[PDB]
Write a protein that binds this ligand. Structure first.
Ligand SMILES: [Ca+2]
Ligand SMILES: [Ca+2]
Ligand SMILES: [Zn+2]
Ligand SMILES: [Zn+2]
Lengths: 273, 273
Protein backbone atom coordinates (compact mmCIF):
# COMPACT_ATOMS: atom_id res chain seq x y z
CA UNK A 1 0.00 0.00 0.00
CA UNK A 2 2.68 2.53 -1.08
CA UNK A 3 1.97 6.23 -1.95
CA UNK A 4 2.25 8.06 -5.32
CA UNK A 5 5.48 9.84 -6.36
CA UNK A 6 4.16 12.36 -8.89
CA UNK A 7 1.08 14.52 -9.24
CA UNK A 8 0.87 13.72 -12.96
CA UNK A 9 -2.26 11.66 -12.31
CA UNK A 10 -3.81 14.40 -10.14
CA UNK A 11 -6.60 16.53 -11.58
CA UNK A 12 -8.41 19.61 -10.31
CA UNK A 13 -12.18 19.90 -10.60
CA UNK A 14 -13.20 23.53 -10.95
CA UNK A 15 -15.76 23.27 -8.15
CA UNK A 16 -13.18 22.59 -5.47
CA UNK A 17 -12.36 26.25 -6.19
CA UNK A 18 -15.86 27.48 -7.15
CA UNK A 19 -14.82 31.03 -6.15
CA UNK A 20 -12.30 31.15 -9.01
CA UNK A 21 -13.25 31.54 -12.65
CA UNK A 22 -11.80 29.22 -15.30
CA UNK A 23 -8.73 31.28 -16.16
CA UNK A 24 -8.03 31.92 -12.47
CA UNK A 25 -8.32 28.15 -12.03
CA UNK A 26 -5.92 27.43 -14.90
CA UNK A 27 -3.41 29.94 -13.51
CA UNK A 28 -3.74 28.26 -10.12
CA UNK A 29 -3.10 24.77 -11.47
CA UNK A 30 -0.05 25.75 -13.50
CA UNK A 31 1.22 27.73 -10.50
CA UNK A 32 0.80 24.54 -8.44
CA UNK A 33 2.21 22.38 -11.29
CA UNK A 34 -1.08 20.47 -11.62
CA UNK A 35 -1.32 18.91 -15.11
CA UNK A 36 -5.00 17.88 -15.28
CA UNK A 37 -8.14 20.00 -14.94
CA UNK A 38 -11.84 19.11 -15.11
CA UNK A 39 -14.08 21.80 -16.57
CA UNK A 40 -17.63 22.78 -15.67
CA UNK A 41 -20.13 23.84 -18.31
CA UNK A 42 -21.30 26.97 -16.46
CA UNK A 43 -17.78 28.40 -16.23
CA UNK A 44 -17.04 27.55 -19.87
CA UNK A 45 -20.23 29.36 -20.89
CA UNK A 46 -19.15 32.26 -18.67
CA UNK A 47 -15.82 32.55 -20.48
CA UNK A 48 -16.79 31.33 -23.94
CA UNK A 49 -16.06 28.06 -25.73
CA UNK A 50 -13.18 29.23 -27.93
CA UNK A 51 -11.89 31.49 -25.16
CA UNK A 52 -11.90 28.71 -22.54
CA UNK A 53 -10.21 26.36 -25.01
CA UNK A 54 -7.45 28.92 -25.57
CA UNK A 55 -7.10 29.49 -21.80
CA UNK A 56 -6.53 25.84 -20.96
CA UNK A 57 -4.45 25.13 -24.05
CA UNK A 58 -1.95 27.96 -23.46
CA UNK A 59 -1.73 26.78 -19.85
CA UNK A 60 -0.65 23.42 -21.26
CA UNK A 61 -3.53 21.81 -19.36
CA UNK A 62 -5.12 18.49 -20.25
CA UNK A 63 -8.85 18.09 -19.63
CA UNK A 64 -9.96 15.06 -17.63
CA UNK A 65 -13.74 15.53 -17.64
CA UNK A 66 -16.41 18.04 -18.62
CA UNK A 67 -19.26 18.37 -16.11
CA UNK A 68 -22.00 17.87 -16.63
CA UNK A 69 -24.40 16.43 -19.16
CA UNK A 70 -27.64 14.76 -18.22
CA UNK A 71 -30.88 15.84 -16.53
CA UNK A 72 -32.78 13.48 -18.82
CA UNK A 73 -36.10 12.95 -16.95
CA UNK A 74 -38.72 15.62 -17.57
CA UNK A 75 -42.48 15.93 -17.14
CA UNK A 76 -43.17 15.84 -20.89
CA UNK A 77 -41.58 14.72 -24.10
CA UNK A 78 -40.70 18.04 -25.73
CA UNK A 79 -38.92 18.90 -22.48
CA UNK A 80 -36.94 15.65 -22.77
CA UNK A 81 -36.07 16.53 -26.37
CA UNK A 82 -34.79 19.92 -25.26
CA UNK A 83 -32.75 18.24 -22.51
CA UNK A 84 -31.11 15.76 -24.86
CA UNK A 85 -30.35 18.58 -27.30
CA UNK A 86 -28.64 20.32 -24.37
CA UNK A 87 -26.82 17.03 -23.88
CA UNK A 88 -25.73 17.23 -27.54
CA UNK A 89 -24.43 20.76 -26.90
CA UNK A 90 -22.52 19.44 -23.90
CA UNK A 91 -21.16 16.64 -26.11
CA UNK A 92 -19.93 19.24 -28.61
CA UNK A 93 -18.41 21.33 -25.81
CA UNK A 94 -16.50 18.26 -24.63
CA UNK A 95 -15.46 17.47 -28.20
CA UNK A 96 -13.85 20.82 -28.97
CA UNK A 97 -12.47 21.12 -25.43
CA UNK A 98 -10.68 17.76 -25.97
CA UNK A 99 -12.34 16.27 -22.89
CA UNK A 100 -11.50 12.66 -22.11
CA UNK A 101 -14.88 11.81 -20.55
CA UNK A 102 -18.21 13.64 -20.54
CA UNK A 103 -19.59 13.10 -17.03
CA UNK A 104 -23.33 12.38 -16.89
CA UNK A 105 -25.51 12.87 -13.84
CA UNK A 106 -28.84 11.90 -15.23
CA UNK A 107 -31.49 13.97 -13.42
CA UNK A 108 -34.16 13.40 -10.78
CA UNK A 109 -37.67 12.07 -11.19
CA UNK A 110 -40.23 14.82 -11.93
CA UNK A 111 -43.01 13.05 -10.02
CA UNK A 112 -42.90 10.05 -7.67
CA UNK A 113 -42.39 7.51 -10.50
CA UNK A 114 -38.69 6.88 -9.97
CA UNK A 115 -38.46 3.71 -12.09
CA UNK A 116 -40.02 5.49 -15.06
CA UNK A 117 -37.38 8.19 -14.68
CA UNK A 118 -34.68 5.51 -14.68
CA UNK A 119 -36.14 4.08 -17.90
CA UNK A 120 -36.06 7.60 -19.36
CA UNK A 121 -32.38 7.81 -18.36
CA UNK A 122 -31.57 4.55 -20.11
CA UNK A 123 -33.39 5.34 -23.36
CA UNK A 124 -31.93 8.85 -23.46
CA UNK A 125 -28.38 7.51 -23.07
CA UNK A 126 -28.97 4.78 -25.68
CA UNK A 127 -30.04 7.53 -28.07
CA UNK A 128 -27.23 9.87 -27.20
CA UNK A 129 -24.50 7.29 -27.76
CA UNK A 130 -24.30 7.56 -31.59
CA UNK A 131 -23.83 11.34 -31.53
CA UNK A 132 -21.22 10.88 -28.80
CA UNK A 133 -19.25 8.20 -30.65
CA UNK A 134 -19.36 10.24 -33.87
CA UNK A 135 -17.49 13.15 -32.25
CA UNK A 136 -14.99 11.00 -30.36
CA UNK A 137 -16.37 11.69 -26.87
CA UNK A 138 -17.10 8.96 -24.32
CA UNK A 139 -19.97 9.28 -21.85
CA UNK A 140 -19.38 8.34 -18.22
CA UNK A 141 -22.29 7.76 -15.85
CA UNK A 142 -21.56 9.08 -12.38
CA UNK A 143 -23.61 7.28 -9.70
CA UNK A 144 -24.61 9.68 -6.94
CA UNK A 145 -25.21 9.10 -3.26
CA UNK A 146 -28.69 7.68 -2.49
CA UNK A 147 -29.45 10.84 -0.49
CA UNK A 148 -29.35 12.70 -3.83
CA UNK A 149 -31.95 10.38 -5.39
CA UNK A 150 -34.78 12.83 -4.70
CA UNK A 151 -32.96 16.04 -5.63
CA UNK A 152 -30.07 15.81 -8.10
CA UNK A 153 -30.31 12.53 -10.06
CA UNK A 154 -31.65 8.99 -10.04
CA UNK A 155 -28.65 6.64 -10.43
CA UNK A 156 -27.71 5.77 -6.87
CA UNK A 157 -25.44 2.69 -6.82
CA UNK A 158 -22.42 1.61 -8.83
CA UNK A 159 -24.07 -1.67 -9.84
CA UNK A 160 -26.88 0.29 -11.52
CA UNK A 161 -24.54 2.49 -13.56
CA UNK A 162 -22.43 -0.52 -14.55
CA UNK A 163 -25.60 -2.30 -15.68
CA UNK A 164 -26.59 0.69 -17.82
CA UNK A 165 -23.08 0.95 -19.28
CA UNK A 166 -22.82 -2.78 -20.05
CA UNK A 167 -25.30 -2.50 -22.94
CA UNK A 168 -22.78 -0.39 -24.88
CA UNK A 169 -19.12 -1.10 -25.54
CA UNK A 170 -16.54 0.53 -23.22
CA UNK A 171 -15.55 2.97 -25.98
CA UNK A 172 -19.12 4.34 -25.98
CA UNK A 173 -20.22 4.32 -22.32
CA UNK A 174 -18.48 3.76 -18.99
CA UNK A 175 -18.83 4.50 -15.28
CA UNK A 176 -17.36 7.23 -13.07
CA UNK A 177 -16.35 6.22 -9.54
CA UNK A 178 -16.64 8.99 -6.89
CA UNK A 179 -15.74 7.79 -3.40
CA UNK A 180 -18.20 10.25 -1.86
CA UNK A 181 -21.21 8.66 -3.57
CA UNK A 182 -20.50 4.94 -3.17
CA UNK A 183 -18.01 4.37 -0.33
CA UNK A 184 -20.92 3.16 1.82
CA UNK A 185 -21.78 0.36 -0.62
CA UNK A 186 -21.58 -3.14 0.92
CA UNK A 187 -20.86 -4.57 -2.55
CA UNK A 188 -18.29 -1.83 -3.20
CA UNK A 189 -15.22 -3.81 -4.26
CA UNK A 190 -17.21 -6.53 -6.04
CA UNK A 191 -18.96 -3.95 -8.22
CA UNK A 192 -15.65 -2.14 -8.78
CA UNK A 193 -14.07 -5.35 -10.06
CA UNK A 194 -17.18 -6.00 -12.16
CA UNK A 195 -16.83 -2.53 -13.74
CA UNK A 196 -13.20 -3.01 -14.83
CA UNK A 197 -12.09 -2.09 -18.28
CA UNK A 198 -15.06 0.32 -18.15
CA UNK A 199 -14.01 2.89 -15.52
CA UNK A 200 -13.52 6.29 -17.17
CA UNK A 201 -12.85 8.49 -14.13
CA UNK A 202 -12.05 8.53 -10.44
CA UNK A 203 -13.01 11.35 -8.07
CA UNK A 204 -11.80 11.54 -4.45
CA UNK A 205 -13.17 13.31 -1.37
CA UNK A 206 -13.99 12.42 2.23
CA UNK A 207 -17.21 11.89 4.19
CA UNK A 208 -17.13 14.13 7.25
CA UNK A 209 -18.72 13.45 10.64
CA UNK A 210 -20.93 15.26 11.28
CA UNK A 211 -22.34 16.31 7.90
CA UNK A 212 -22.54 20.12 7.58
CA UNK A 213 -24.70 20.22 4.44
CA UNK A 214 -26.41 17.53 2.41
CA UNK A 215 -25.49 19.19 -0.88
CA UNK A 216 -22.21 20.61 0.46
CA UNK A 217 -20.94 17.97 2.91
CA UNK A 218 -17.74 16.79 1.25
CA UNK A 219 -14.27 17.53 2.58
CA UNK A 220 -10.71 16.90 1.54
CA UNK A 221 -8.89 13.62 2.03
CA UNK A 222 -7.77 12.38 5.44
CA UNK A 223 -10.37 14.20 7.55
CA UNK A 224 -13.26 11.77 7.05
CA UNK A 225 -14.05 8.06 7.33
CA UNK A 226 -13.44 6.81 3.77
CA UNK A 227 -10.59 4.34 3.18
CA UNK A 228 -9.38 6.14 0.06
CA UNK A 229 -6.17 4.22 -0.64
CA UNK A 230 -7.98 0.87 -0.52
CA UNK A 231 -10.69 2.02 -2.94
CA UNK A 232 -8.21 3.49 -5.39
CA UNK A 233 -5.99 0.40 -5.27
CA UNK A 234 -9.16 -1.53 -6.09
CA UNK A 235 -9.88 0.80 -9.01
CA UNK A 236 -6.28 0.52 -10.25
CA UNK A 237 -6.43 -3.26 -10.02
CA UNK A 238 -9.52 -2.64 -12.17
CA UNK A 239 -7.23 -1.31 -14.90
CA UNK A 240 -7.91 2.41 -14.47
CA UNK A 241 -4.75 4.37 -15.29
CA UNK A 242 -6.48 7.66 -16.09
CA UNK A 243 -6.41 10.94 -14.17
CA UNK A 244 -7.61 11.25 -10.58
CA UNK A 245 -9.83 14.27 -10.00
CA UNK A 246 -10.59 15.51 -6.49
CA UNK A 247 -14.13 16.92 -6.30
CA UNK A 248 -15.21 18.58 -3.05
CA UNK A 249 -18.54 20.31 -2.34
CA UNK A 250 -17.93 22.44 0.75
CA UNK A 251 -18.56 26.08 1.60
CA UNK A 252 -15.78 26.19 4.21
CA UNK A 253 -13.20 25.18 1.60
CA UNK A 254 -14.73 27.30 -1.19
CA UNK A 255 -14.36 30.59 0.70
CA UNK A 256 -10.66 29.92 1.24
CA UNK A 257 -8.29 31.33 -1.41
CA UNK A 258 -7.61 28.55 -3.88
CA UNK A 259 -3.83 28.45 -3.48
CA UNK A 260 -4.23 27.27 0.13
CA UNK A 261 -6.60 24.51 -0.90
CA UNK A 262 -4.47 23.37 -3.85
CA UNK A 263 -1.40 23.16 -1.61
CA UNK A 264 -3.44 21.10 0.85
CA UNK A 265 -4.83 19.16 -2.13
CA UNK A 266 -1.43 18.03 -3.36
CA UNK A 267 -0.06 17.38 0.14
CA UNK A 268 -2.92 15.11 1.21
CA UNK A 269 -3.28 13.58 -2.25
CA UNK A 270 0.28 12.34 -1.83
CA UNK A 271 -0.28 11.39 1.81
CA UNK A 272 -3.66 9.64 1.64
CA UNK A 273 -4.93 8.89 -1.89
CA UNK B 1 -54.73 0.53 -5.98
CA UNK B 2 -56.46 -0.10 -2.65
CA UNK B 3 -56.80 1.50 0.74
CA UNK B 4 -57.33 0.40 4.34
CA UNK B 5 -60.80 0.49 5.89
CA UNK B 6 -59.74 0.12 9.55
CA UNK B 7 -56.78 1.22 11.65
CA UNK B 8 -56.30 -2.17 13.35
CA UNK B 9 -52.95 -2.67 11.57
CA UNK B 10 -51.72 0.86 12.41
CA UNK B 11 -49.17 1.31 15.18
CA UNK B 12 -47.64 4.33 16.91
CA UNK B 13 -43.89 4.53 17.43
CA UNK B 14 -43.07 6.54 20.55
CA UNK B 15 -40.50 8.68 18.72
CA UNK B 16 -42.99 10.44 16.46
CA UNK B 17 -44.35 11.80 19.77
CA UNK B 18 -40.96 12.28 21.48
CA UNK B 19 -42.46 15.04 23.67
CA UNK B 20 -44.86 12.62 25.36
CA UNK B 21 -43.85 10.10 28.00
CA UNK B 22 -44.93 6.46 27.80
CA UNK B 23 -48.13 6.93 29.77
CA UNK B 24 -48.89 10.10 27.81
CA UNK B 25 -48.36 8.04 24.66
CA UNK B 26 -50.59 5.18 25.86
CA UNK B 27 -53.30 7.66 26.87
CA UNK B 28 -53.02 9.33 23.47
CA UNK B 29 -53.45 6.06 21.59
CA UNK B 30 -56.38 4.92 23.73
CA UNK B 31 -57.96 8.33 23.16
CA UNK B 32 -57.41 7.82 19.41
CA UNK B 33 -58.36 4.09 19.56
CA UNK B 34 -55.00 3.04 18.08
CA UNK B 35 -54.35 -0.62 18.99
CA UNK B 36 -50.60 -1.05 18.39
CA UNK B 37 -47.67 0.83 19.95
CA UNK B 38 -43.89 0.55 19.51
CA UNK B 39 -41.84 1.30 22.61
CA UNK B 40 -38.39 2.83 23.04
CA UNK B 41 -35.98 1.60 25.69
CA UNK B 42 -35.07 5.03 27.10
CA UNK B 43 -38.67 5.94 27.92
CA UNK B 44 -39.35 2.46 29.33
CA UNK B 45 -36.34 2.88 31.63
CA UNK B 46 -37.64 6.35 32.50
CA UNK B 47 -40.97 4.90 33.63
CA UNK B 48 -39.80 1.46 34.79
CA UNK B 49 -40.10 -2.01 33.28
CA UNK B 50 -42.92 -3.41 35.44
CA UNK B 51 -44.62 -0.01 35.53
CA UNK B 52 -44.45 0.35 31.73
CA UNK B 53 -45.88 -3.14 31.30
CA UNK B 54 -48.78 -2.23 33.59
CA UNK B 55 -49.28 1.06 31.70
CA UNK B 56 -49.61 -0.72 28.35
CA UNK B 57 -51.53 -3.66 29.82
CA UNK B 58 -54.47 -1.70 31.24
CA UNK B 59 -54.55 0.37 28.05
CA UNK B 60 -55.26 -2.83 26.12
CA UNK B 61 -52.37 -1.99 23.80
CA UNK B 62 -50.41 -4.54 21.79
CA UNK B 63 -46.72 -3.75 21.34
CA UNK B 64 -45.31 -4.09 17.82
CA UNK B 65 -41.59 -3.41 18.36
CA UNK B 66 -39.10 -2.48 21.07
CA UNK B 67 -36.46 0.12 20.16
CA UNK B 68 -33.69 -0.55 20.03
CA UNK B 69 -31.06 -3.24 20.43
CA UNK B 70 -27.71 -3.23 18.69
CA UNK B 71 -24.61 -1.01 18.72
CA UNK B 72 -22.45 -4.11 18.35
CA UNK B 73 -19.21 -2.67 16.87
CA UNK B 74 -16.82 -1.26 19.45
CA UNK B 75 -13.14 -0.42 19.61
CA UNK B 76 -12.36 -3.34 21.95
CA UNK B 77 -13.64 -6.73 22.89
CA UNK B 78 -14.68 -6.08 26.48
CA UNK B 79 -16.68 -3.18 25.06
CA UNK B 80 -18.35 -5.49 22.53
CA UNK B 81 -19.13 -7.92 25.36
CA UNK B 82 -20.72 -5.05 27.29
CA UNK B 83 -22.71 -4.04 24.20
CA UNK B 84 -24.09 -7.55 23.78
CA UNK B 85 -24.84 -7.73 27.51
CA UNK B 86 -26.96 -4.62 26.98
CA UNK B 87 -28.46 -6.43 23.98
CA UNK B 88 -29.33 -9.30 26.33
CA UNK B 89 -30.97 -6.74 28.61
CA UNK B 90 -32.97 -5.43 25.64
CA UNK B 91 -33.97 -9.00 24.79
CA UNK B 92 -35.25 -9.41 28.36
CA UNK B 93 -37.17 -6.13 28.15
CA UNK B 94 -38.81 -7.22 24.89
CA UNK B 95 -39.61 -10.64 26.36
CA UNK B 96 -41.31 -9.35 29.50
CA UNK B 97 -43.09 -6.56 27.60
CA UNK B 98 -44.45 -9.17 25.13
CA UNK B 99 -42.96 -7.34 22.14
CA UNK B 100 -43.46 -9.00 18.76
CA UNK B 101 -40.04 -8.10 17.31
CA UNK B 102 -36.91 -6.63 18.89
CA UNK B 103 -35.64 -4.05 16.41
CA UNK B 104 -31.87 -4.09 15.84
CA UNK B 105 -29.95 -1.15 14.42
CA UNK B 106 -26.45 -2.45 14.42
CA UNK B 107 -24.11 0.49 15.07
CA UNK B 108 -21.40 2.42 13.24
CA UNK B 109 -17.79 1.49 12.67
CA UNK B 110 -15.46 2.84 15.39
CA UNK B 111 -12.61 3.47 12.93
CA UNK B 112 -12.60 3.49 9.11
CA UNK B 113 -12.77 -0.33 8.82
CA UNK B 114 -16.44 -0.64 7.90
CA UNK B 115 -16.35 -4.26 6.66
CA UNK B 116 -14.78 -5.41 9.92
CA UNK B 117 -17.66 -3.71 11.70
CA UNK B 118 -20.11 -5.60 9.48
CA UNK B 119 -18.38 -8.86 10.43
CA UNK B 120 -18.66 -7.85 14.10
CA UNK B 121 -22.39 -7.25 13.57
CA UNK B 122 -23.01 -10.66 12.07
CA UNK B 123 -20.99 -12.57 14.68
CA UNK B 124 -22.74 -10.64 17.47
CA UNK B 125 -26.17 -11.51 16.06
CA UNK B 126 -25.10 -15.15 15.66
CA UNK B 127 -24.13 -15.25 19.34
CA UNK B 128 -27.23 -13.36 20.45
CA UNK B 129 -29.85 -15.48 18.69
CA UNK B 130 -29.87 -18.49 21.12
CA UNK B 131 -30.58 -16.27 24.13
CA UNK B 132 -33.31 -14.61 22.06
CA UNK B 133 -35.05 -17.74 20.82
CA UNK B 134 -34.92 -19.11 24.38
CA UNK B 135 -37.03 -16.20 25.66
CA UNK B 136 -39.44 -16.23 22.72
CA UNK B 137 -38.27 -12.96 21.14
CA UNK B 138 -37.40 -12.58 17.46
CA UNK B 139 -34.69 -10.15 16.34
CA UNK B 140 -35.39 -7.93 13.35
CA UNK B 141 -32.53 -6.22 11.52
CA UNK B 142 -33.50 -2.73 10.34
CA UNK B 143 -31.38 -1.56 7.37
CA UNK B 144 -30.78 2.20 7.63
CA UNK B 145 -30.28 4.80 4.93
CA UNK B 146 -26.74 4.85 3.47
CA UNK B 147 -26.34 8.42 4.74
CA UNK B 148 -26.45 6.92 8.26
CA UNK B 149 -23.61 4.50 7.47
CA UNK B 150 -21.05 6.75 9.18
CA UNK B 151 -23.09 7.70 12.25
CA UNK B 152 -25.86 5.34 13.40
CA UNK B 153 -25.34 1.88 11.89
CA UNK B 154 -23.56 -0.19 9.27
CA UNK B 155 -26.33 -2.17 7.53
CA UNK B 156 -27.42 0.16 4.74
CA UNK B 157 -29.27 -1.93 2.13
CA UNK B 158 -32.13 -4.41 2.33
CA UNK B 159 -30.12 -7.08 0.50
CA UNK B 160 -27.46 -6.94 3.22
CA UNK B 161 -29.93 -7.39 6.08
CA UNK B 162 -31.74 -10.17 4.21
CA UNK B 163 -28.40 -11.93 3.68
CA UNK B 164 -27.63 -11.69 7.40
CA UNK B 165 -31.12 -12.93 8.32
CA UNK B 166 -31.04 -15.87 5.89
CA UNK B 167 -28.47 -17.67 8.06
CA UNK B 168 -30.99 -18.13 10.91
CA UNK B 169 -34.59 -19.34 10.98
CA UNK B 170 -37.45 -16.92 10.23
CA UNK B 171 -38.49 -17.51 13.85
CA UNK B 172 -34.97 -16.53 14.92
CA UNK B 173 -34.11 -13.37 12.91
CA UNK B 174 -35.87 -11.36 10.21
CA UNK B 175 -35.70 -7.95 8.52
CA UNK B 176 -37.49 -4.67 9.25
CA UNK B 177 -38.59 -2.61 6.24
CA UNK B 178 -38.72 1.16 6.72
CA UNK B 179 -39.59 3.12 3.59
CA UNK B 180 -37.41 6.04 4.71
CA UNK B 181 -34.24 3.92 4.65
CA UNK B 182 -34.92 1.81 1.56
CA UNK B 183 -37.21 3.65 -0.85
CA UNK B 184 -34.23 4.79 -2.95
CA UNK B 185 -33.06 1.24 -3.64
CA UNK B 186 -33.01 0.32 -7.36
CA UNK B 187 -33.49 -3.34 -6.39
CA UNK B 188 -36.17 -2.42 -3.84
CA UNK B 189 -39.06 -4.64 -4.93
CA UNK B 190 -36.81 -7.56 -5.93
CA UNK B 191 -35.19 -7.58 -2.48
CA UNK B 192 -38.61 -7.20 -0.86
CA UNK B 193 -39.86 -10.29 -2.71
CA UNK B 194 -36.63 -12.10 -1.79
CA UNK B 195 -37.18 -11.27 1.89
CA UNK B 196 -40.63 -12.95 2.05
CA UNK B 197 -41.75 -14.99 4.96
CA UNK B 198 -39.04 -13.05 6.84
CA UNK B 199 -40.41 -9.50 7.17
CA UNK B 200 -41.05 -8.72 10.84
CA UNK B 201 -42.11 -5.07 10.69
CA UNK B 202 -43.08 -2.20 8.42
CA UNK B 203 -42.33 1.48 9.11
CA UNK B 204 -43.72 4.30 6.96
CA UNK B 205 -42.71 7.95 6.51
CA UNK B 206 -42.03 10.27 3.58
CA UNK B 207 -38.87 11.78 2.10
CA UNK B 208 -39.31 15.56 1.99
CA UNK B 209 -37.76 17.98 -0.49
CA UNK B 210 -35.64 19.61 0.73
CA UNK B 211 -34.31 17.63 3.70
CA UNK B 212 -34.36 19.80 6.87
CA UNK B 213 -32.11 17.57 8.98
CA UNK B 214 -30.08 14.51 8.05
CA UNK B 215 -30.87 12.72 11.32
CA UNK B 216 -34.37 14.25 11.61
CA UNK B 217 -35.53 14.58 7.99
CA UNK B 218 -38.59 12.33 7.99
CA UNK B 219 -42.13 13.61 7.60
CA UNK B 220 -45.63 12.23 7.67
CA UNK B 221 -47.06 10.30 4.76
CA UNK B 222 -48.16 12.13 1.64
CA UNK B 223 -45.75 15.07 2.03
CA UNK B 224 -42.79 13.48 0.23
CA UNK B 225 -41.80 11.53 -2.88
CA UNK B 226 -42.10 7.92 -1.63
CA UNK B 227 -44.57 5.59 -3.35
CA UNK B 228 -45.89 4.24 -0.06
CA UNK B 229 -48.87 2.26 -1.36
CA UNK B 230 -46.71 0.44 -3.91
CA UNK B 231 -44.05 -0.53 -1.36
CA UNK B 232 -46.61 -1.77 1.15
CA UNK B 233 -48.50 -3.75 -1.49
CA UNK B 234 -45.13 -5.30 -2.38
CA UNK B 235 -44.51 -6.26 1.25
CA UNK B 236 -48.11 -7.50 1.59
CA UNK B 237 -47.70 -9.71 -1.46
CA UNK B 238 -44.61 -10.76 0.52
CA UNK B 239 -46.88 -12.23 3.19
CA UNK B 240 -46.50 -9.57 5.89
CA UNK B 241 -49.75 -9.37 7.84
CA UNK B 242 -48.26 -7.78 10.96
CA UNK B 243 -48.71 -4.27 12.30
CA UNK B 244 -47.68 -1.18 10.36
CA UNK B 245 -45.71 1.28 12.48
CA UNK B 246 -45.25 4.89 11.44
CA UNK B 247 -41.85 6.22 12.55
CA UNK B 248 -41.11 9.90 11.92
CA UNK B 249 -37.94 11.75 12.92
CA UNK B 250 -38.82 15.44 12.58
CA UNK B 251 -38.62 18.50 14.81
CA UNK B 252 -41.43 20.20 12.88
CA UNK B 253 -43.81 17.33 13.74
CA UNK B 254 -42.40 17.09 17.29
CA UNK B 255 -43.60 20.60 18.16
CA UNK B 256 -47.23 19.64 17.58
CA UNK B 257 -49.54 18.51 20.39
CA UNK B 258 -49.82 14.75 20.06
CA UNK B 259 -53.56 14.70 19.41
CA UNK B 260 -52.99 16.66 16.19
CA UNK B 261 -50.26 14.38 14.94
CA UNK B 262 -52.14 11.15 15.73
CA UNK B 263 -55.22 12.54 13.98
CA UNK B 264 -53.08 13.41 10.95
CA UNK B 265 -51.39 10.02 11.32
CA UNK B 266 -54.65 8.10 10.96
CA UNK B 267 -55.99 10.44 8.27
CA UNK B 268 -52.97 10.00 6.00
CA UNK B 269 -52.51 6.33 6.94
CA UNK B 270 -55.94 5.60 5.49
CA UNK B 271 -55.55 8.17 2.69
CA UNK B 272 -52.03 7.38 1.46
CA UNK B 273 -50.56 4.20 2.98
CA1 LIG C 1 -17.84 15.39 -11.03
CA1 LIG D 1 -37.30 2.04 14.26
ZN1 LIG E 1 -16.95 13.06 -8.23
ZN1 LIG F 1 -36.81 2.79 11.48
Amino acid sequence: MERFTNIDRLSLNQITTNSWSLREAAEGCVRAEIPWIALWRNKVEEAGLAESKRIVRDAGLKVSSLCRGGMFPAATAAERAARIDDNRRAIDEAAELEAEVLVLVCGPAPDRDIDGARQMVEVAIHELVPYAQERGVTLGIEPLHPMYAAERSVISTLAQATTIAERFTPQQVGVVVDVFHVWWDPELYKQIARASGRILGFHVSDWIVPTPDMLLGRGMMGDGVIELNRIRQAVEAAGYRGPIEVEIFNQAIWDRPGDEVLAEMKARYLEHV
